Design an enzyme around this catalytic site. Structure first.
Site, PDB file in Angstrom:
ATOM      1  N   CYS A   6     -31.582 -27.331  34.430  1.00 47.32           N
ATOM      2  CA  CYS A   6     -32.245 -28.230  35.364  1.00 47.32           C
ATOM      3  C   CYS A   6     -31.239 -28.703  36.407  1.00 47.32           C
ATOM      4  O   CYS A   6     -30.189 -29.254  36.060  1.00 47.32           O
ATOM      5  CB  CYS A   6     -32.856 -29.415  34.619  1.00 47.32           C
ATOM      6  SG  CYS A   6     -33.922 -30.468  35.621  1.00 47.32           S
ATOM      7  N   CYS A  47     -30.437 -32.515  36.668  1.00 44.23           N
ATOM      8  CA  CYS A  47     -29.740 -33.092  35.524  1.00 44.23           C
ATOM      9  C   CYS A  47     -28.235 -33.202  35.743  1.00 44.23           C
ATOM     10  O   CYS A  47     -27.579 -33.971  35.036  1.00 44.23           O
ATOM     11  CB  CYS A  47     -30.030 -32.272  34.267  1.00 44.23           C
ATOM     12  SG  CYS A  47     -31.645 -32.606  33.526  1.00 44.23           S
TER      13      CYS A  47
END
Lengths: 49, 38, 114, 726
Positions: free
Chosen positions: C37, C40
RNA sequence: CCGGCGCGCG
């Protein structure tokens, strides 16, 4: 000094027909590479071209 | 010699003169490069 | 001799379960993240800064959804990044925040809600 | 280094750790931390070494990769030698791990031999501390010279050439100038030293569907570099077919091809992969001829840190990496909070651990350049481990800052920028724009103004600081191989000024671009002006034309128009001639006839300057044997009149000028003293008529070979033979 | 006030 010649990016003038001539040379190189892969010309003929 | 070498190739290495069906371009390349460069 | 570069610890579902079940004195902040991700990474840096801010006044942990996918789904995680602010008082209810919330938002939540 | 640019000192760091790991054991077939601190070893001229248990002392490498012996920083450079002879697959690289372990082989057959290794070995060199750029690039050099290696005379002409195995491992631009050209190399940004002594570079693997391939970044030794089809192009091309038969340039078997994407194995995707640190700090390098790229890298290593530093408006994004890996700024070793800051120290406290970090204040380098540090944090700020705490010399905000952003015009001005001269404004002088501190050491009251004039700043050894403002004869240069000497300084009312009324600070000759073929300086100056008006900085990776045709032109022109529109300055972008504007003569107020390219480029000040090159001599000390004047500015020596200078005088026919510089200005002991006397009384200098001490010296030497050389004069009057005393 | 080694400038 009075005239004050300078040098810009715009002043570096490529001739108008470069894009035409580069495209033709690219077309001829693309055609010969395919026919070299076909076995219609040999390596030296491709290298010279 | 080039009579026993061919026989040895056939017998021991599976050689055979299979027909190569060529395009006109490949045929011209084979027939014309036998004469010279230009 | 050499200090560790990261203060946020990665916990399993069972370890987080034991942490929540056990007695807690400071607020516990749980991060759900995945290495694939993109957002993130920024959340990881933000939570490292937050952990530096709250030396012993808060606990910052992270759970990888690639190892605890079912646990994340059970805890009502709908996407990443997702943060869970768990108060030391069992009577209170935890807060789930979704998105790349600012550091000041985390500070406000910890100060005025945990 | 799979996903980030590796530490520039990682090769030295890994080599030394390997030597401690297996090099010590492999040669002994227990170390204690040094008692002296690293600062103490250099302060009072000791060697930073650790004790081996009492066999000897083993020198320790600093985290920056440099040793300290006798208080002198030293660097151990790498060597290339034979393992297609010039193929890199038949080479090996010997790091500090191999050099330190090898000396242990001699040591055990410690303290003295290691001391003599750093002093005498050619591969051990004094660290260059001119600026943060020189500190790191010195340790990444590759040499064919040294013991076991070829000499310049020994060097083959096929060597010194670029081999295709060098791509990604050895920079094709960076090399030494002179007889040692092509023999001193430099490692690439992403290069790594493998386990077999070979250099490796990372390439991205393109592999079929049925393969895990957890990490697609893998390093190639040059042996396996040949047998992979590596492409450097992109996949932004589509026709009525599909993407796999689109053709791209590629490398295979030492030659360049053009094949389809489906036949490509590896991709070169890193932007700084093929270059060294020096060539990676040149913005718009793809528009500069590679000949000037080599000189530009050298010039950046001669930049003097200025008393006040500022970041470049236009950069490449590698300035931050250079600052971090140089050790010049202060980097936190522990997370925590800032509690106290001042000039002398910074106090950081975290996790019940409070540390005090001293700061360098006006210290001297090996090149007489000042070092200084200023806090980059305030009290009450949270800090991560590894984050910046203070800014050092030539470093602003964690970036390398070797120069200044100044207003510049490119036009001829009355011959004062003839050839390579530079005309500057007085604002650069009284504004202290290019003022640098310089400190010498000499083996007196502290704070006294001695009269080499300067202020005594430290006594232990006397250190004298010299504040050097920019002057006529100083050398300035840009990052595109555009060097020049300052020949004229004008008042601000005399300089040409723009349509906003602001005078320019420097005027450059436009004739220096076409012959030198560095167009990247025109790109940078235009974008530097746009960034200053827009309050923007630009960090642009090289070869941006991989995205699209004329990518640099689109970026510069669009940013120029944004600055013109936002600030309401229509001269900043001119539709008729973008990048150029009509400026006015400061002496007449009349516009110059043609539009002039103007901007705000990044200009550096170099070490080569006057006050270190002006020499004069009347007479003085002579050599003991030859009795000729000494050699060197430091020795107040004279200038040599070589044999080529003698040919010129003989071509002119000036036989009496030649005899002056052959007898009584060089070595005629008797006639040197009389010339000193006659000139003070002005009473005519006579001919020497005797032999100079260089000829008498040769006669005695020939006598030592049992040979007699006599000079005879035969009179044209009575034919009497006269023996001249020699 | 002597020579080697290294780094540079034109």
């Amino acid at each position: 000094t009075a005239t004050s010649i300078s040098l810009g990016i715009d002043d570096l003038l490529t001739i108008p027909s470069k894009g035409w001539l580069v495209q033709d040379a690219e077309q001829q190189s693309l055609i010969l590479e395919k026919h070299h892969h076909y076995g219609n010309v040999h390596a030296v003929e491709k290298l010279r071209q | 010699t080039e009579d026993e070498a061919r026989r040895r190739n056939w017998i021991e290495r599976g050689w055979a003169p299979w027909e190569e069906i060529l395009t006109p371009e490949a045929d011209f390349a084979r027939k014309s490069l036998n004469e010279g460069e230009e | 001799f050499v200090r560790e570069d990261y203060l946020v610890r990665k916990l399993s579902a069972q370890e987080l379960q034991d942490l929540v079940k056990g007695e807690r004195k400071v607020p516990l902040i749980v991060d759900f993240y995945a290495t694939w991700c993109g957002p993130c990474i920024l959340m990881a840096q933000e939570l490292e800064m937050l952990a530096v801010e709250y030396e012993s006044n808060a606990m910052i942990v992270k759970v990888d959804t690639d190892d605890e996918y079912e646990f994340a789904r059970d805890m009502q995680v709908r996407g990443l990044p997702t943060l869970f602010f768990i108060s030391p008082d069992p009577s209170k209810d935890a807060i789930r925040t979704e998105g790349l919330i600012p550091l000041q938002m985390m500070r406000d939540i910890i100060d005025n809600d945990m | 280094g799979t996903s980030t640019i590796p530490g520039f000192n990682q090769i030295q760091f890994e080599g030394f750790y390997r030597f401690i790991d297996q090099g010590l054991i492999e040669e002994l077939s227990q170390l204690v931390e040094p008692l002296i601190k690293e600062r103490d070893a250099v302060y009072e001229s000791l060697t930073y070494s650790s004790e081996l248990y009492f066999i000897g002392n083993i020198p320790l490498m600093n985290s920056l990769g440099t040793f300290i012996v006798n208080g002198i920083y030293r660097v151990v450079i790498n060597q290339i030698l034979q393992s297609d002879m010039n193929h890199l697959k038949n080479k090996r690289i010997r790091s500090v791990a191999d050099l330190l372990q090898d000396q242990l082989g001699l040591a055990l057959a410690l303290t003295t031999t290691y001391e003599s290794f750093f002093g005498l070995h050619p591969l051990s060199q004094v660290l260059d501390r001119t600026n943060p750029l020189t500190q790191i690039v010195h340790g990444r050099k590759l040499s064919y010279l040294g013991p076991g290696g070829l000499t310049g005379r020994t060097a083959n002409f096929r060597i010194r050439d670029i081999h295709p195995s060098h791509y990604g491992r050895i920079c094709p631009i960076d090399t030494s100038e002179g007889i040692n050209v092509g023999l001193i190399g430099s490692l690439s940004i992403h290069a790594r030293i493998g386990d077999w002594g070979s250099l490796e570079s990372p390439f991205y693997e393109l592999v079929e569907k049925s393969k895990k391939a957890q990490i697609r970044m893998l390093f190639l030794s040059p042996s396996q570099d040949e047998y992979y089809m590596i492409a450097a192009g992109n996949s932004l091309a589509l026709n009525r077919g599909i993407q796999e038969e689109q053709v791209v340039p590629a490398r295979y078997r030492q030659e360049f091809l053009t094949i389809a994407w489906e036949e490509v194995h590896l991709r070169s995707i890193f932007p700084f992969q093929y270059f060294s640190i020096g060539a990676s700090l040149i913005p718009f390098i793809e528009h500069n001829d590679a000949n000037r790229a080599l000189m530009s890298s050298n010039m950046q290593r001669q930049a003097v840190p200025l008393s006040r530093s500022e970041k470049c408006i236009v950069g490449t994004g590698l300035e931050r990496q250079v600052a971090l890996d140089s050790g010049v700024p202060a980097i936190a070793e522990h997370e925590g909070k800032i509690l106290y800051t001042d000039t002398e120290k910074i106090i950081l406290s975290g996790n019940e651990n409070t540390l005090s970090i001293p700061l360098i204040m006006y210290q001297r380098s090996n090149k007489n350049t000042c070092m200084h540090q200023k806090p980059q944090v305030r009290r009450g700020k949270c800090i991560k481990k590894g984050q910046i705490l203070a800014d050092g010399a030539a470093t602003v905000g964690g970036e390398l800052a070797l120069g200044k952003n100044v207003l510049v015009a490119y036009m001829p001005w009355e011959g004062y920028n003839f050839e390579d001269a530079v005309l500057i404004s007085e604002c650069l002088v009284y504004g202290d724009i290019y003022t640098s501190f310089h400190i010498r050491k000499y083996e007196v009251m502290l704070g006294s103004w001695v009269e080499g004039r300067g202020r005594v700043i430290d006594v232990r050894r006397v250190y004298i600081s010299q504040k050097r403002e920019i002057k006529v004869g100083d050398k300035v240069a840009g990052r595109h191989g555009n060097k020049g000497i300052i020949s004229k300084i004008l008042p601000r009312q005399d300089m040409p000024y723009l349509q906003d009324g602001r005078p320019v600070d420097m005027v450059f000759n436009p004739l220096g671009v076409p012959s030198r073929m560095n167009v990247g300086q025109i790109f940078e100056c235009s974008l530097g002006l746009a960034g200053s008006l827009l309050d923007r900085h630009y960090r642009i990776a090289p070869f941006d034309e991989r995205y699209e045709q004329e990518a640099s032109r689109k970026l510069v022109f669009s940013e120029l128009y944004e600055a013109s529109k936002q600030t309401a300055n229509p001269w900043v972008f001119e539709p008729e001639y973008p990048g150029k504007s009509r400026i006015f003569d400061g002496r007449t107020g009349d516009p110059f006839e043609q539009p002039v390219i103007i901007g705000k480029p990044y200009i550096l000040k170099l070490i080569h300057q006057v006050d270190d090159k002006i020499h004069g001599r009347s007479s003085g000390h002579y050599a003991l044997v030859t009795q000729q004047p000494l050699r060197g500015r430091s020795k107040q020596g004279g200038q040599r009149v070589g044999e080529m200078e003698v040919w010129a005088l003989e071509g002119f026919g000036v036989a009496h000028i030649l005899q002056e510089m052959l007898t009584y200005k060089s070595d005629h002991i008797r006639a040197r003293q009389e010339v000193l006397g006659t000139t003070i009384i002005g009473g005519t200098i006579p001919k020497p008529e005797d032999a100079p001490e260089s000829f008498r010296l040769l006669v005695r030497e020939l006598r030592s070979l049992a040979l007699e050389l006599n000079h005879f004069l035969v009179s044209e009057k009575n034919f009497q033979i006269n023996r001249k005393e020699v």
